């Protein structure tokens, strides 16, 4: 295991994350665990959303994830929706929601 990603068991790039944390003026010095921890968090969140969007993509009879599927996946998960509360997803559209009083009687 020459790479740090293999040493940490991650698909995300620990070294790049370590670079970004030094070239962003967050602090003087960056700890050796920080870019491992962070990469893992980012990898975790990434997977979770791709899980749900890929599910959305099967319900719509598709091989490919498109912005709509990400939007459906986020705006239906209660926690993902909160994390991305001030977040516009281009080409996402909106969840189907008609108010009760507007339906005929």
């Amino acid at each position: 295991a020459k790479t740090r990603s293999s040493r940490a068991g991650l698909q995300f790039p620990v070294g790049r994350v370590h670079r970004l944390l030094r070239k962003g003026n967050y602090s003087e010095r960056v700890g050796a665990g920080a870019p491992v921890y962070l990469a893992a968090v980012l990898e975790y969140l990434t997977a979770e959303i791709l899980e749900l969007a890929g599910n959305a993509a099967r319900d719509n009879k598709k091989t490919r994830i498109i912005p709509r599927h990400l939007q459906l996946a986020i705006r239906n998960d209660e926690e993902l929706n909160k994390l991305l509360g001030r977040v516009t997803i281009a080409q996402g559209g909106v969840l189907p929601n008609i108010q009760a009083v507007l339906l005929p009687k």
Binding site: P67, V87, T88, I89, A90, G93, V94, N97, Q99, L102
Partner: protein, 79 residues
């Protein structure tokens, strides 16, 4: 007078996606007024970025950095 180009039916469509069933006739001019204020606010900052970058072309990242300033972050155009 390009603001009229945001046409009554276009505004209607936007309200439909927003789950609106019945639209008063005053809404359309009201909505135009509102849009114009949003675009002014966003464009003002984008341009403020563009000018600081010593450019004569507004990029998408000029807009994206402006939108994040308004608290209205946008995914799919960089950033």
């Amino acid at each position: 007078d390009n603001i009229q180009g945001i046409t009554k039916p276009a505004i209607r469509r936007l309200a439909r996606r927003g789950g609106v069933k019945r639209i008063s006739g005053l809404i359309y001019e009201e909505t135009r007024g509102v849009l114009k204020v949003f675009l002014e606010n966003v464009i003002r900052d984008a341009v403020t970025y563009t000018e600081h970058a010593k450019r004569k072309t507004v990029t998408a990242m000029d807009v994206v950095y402006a939108l994040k300033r308004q608290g209205r972050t946008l995914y799919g155009f960089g950033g």
